[PDB]
Amino acid sequence: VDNKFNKEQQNAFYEILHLPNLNEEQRNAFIQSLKDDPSQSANLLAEAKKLNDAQAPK
Amino acid sequence: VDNKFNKETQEASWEIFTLPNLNGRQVAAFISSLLDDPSQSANLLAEAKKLNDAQAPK
């Protein structure tokens, strides 16, 4: 496990917080699995971005 | 919304996630309150530190 908090692990965090359309309830779920599984830093991110785009306007 | 947190808040956010003693659930709880209350950022990051050091080894 890479608890050292690599670069991508740091970027994934912020990127998840930047999501405007994404609510705190969802963002929390990602941050949760992010700390429990830093390896998903790329997966959860894509899932958060995909979710932020789901609530995105027209 | 970025209208609440920009950088100053993002700093406290990362500090909360960098806590190894805290799990994903605990941190995601301090991050939420942060973005929802960028005013208590220092109080939220403080609590986070009090929790980490609490369950901490020493």
XYZ file of C-alpha atoms in Angstrom, chain B:
58
model
C -18.921 25.436 -5.234
C -15.582 27.213 -5.684
C -17.337 30.315 -4.353
C -16.819 28.842 -0.884
C -13.418 27.148 -1.120
C -10.523 28.096 -3.403
C -7.100 27.404 -1.907
C -6.872 28.465 1.736
C -9.597 25.890 2.357
C -8.054 23.245 0.104
C -4.946 23.361 2.296
C -6.904 22.343 5.378
C -8.650 19.688 3.287
C -5.425 17.916 2.328
C -4.111 18.152 5.899
C -7.212 16.258 7.011
C -6.663 13.517 4.431
C -2.971 13.207 5.300
C -3.961 11.909 8.742
C -3.051 8.165 8.734
C -4.826 7.460 12.024
C -8.097 8.659 10.496
C -9.990 6.417 8.092
C -11.871 7.426 4.967
C -15.098 7.927 6.896
C -13.573 10.207 9.527
C -11.648 12.375 7.055
C -14.566 12.596 4.599
C -16.457 13.998 7.578
C -13.920 16.760 8.200
C -13.672 17.580 4.487
C -17.428 17.966 4.146
C -17.793 20.363 7.075
C -14.840 22.239 5.592
C -16.303 22.955 2.158
C -19.645 23.596 3.861
C -18.053 25.904 6.433
C -14.732 27.380 5.153
C -14.927 29.600 8.231
C -14.272 26.815 10.740
C -11.512 25.449 8.525
C -8.982 25.841 11.335
C -11.435 24.382 13.847
C -12.280 21.481 11.563
C -8.646 20.763 10.802
C -7.976 21.149 14.501
C -10.568 18.546 15.453
C -9.210 16.289 12.751
C -5.779 16.564 14.348
C -7.273 15.928 17.788
C -8.903 12.775 16.441
C -5.811 11.522 14.630
C -3.546 12.047 17.636
C -6.307 10.512 19.763
C -6.327 7.090 18.106
C -2.641 7.614 17.321
C -0.093 5.162 18.829
C 1.612 7.520 21.279
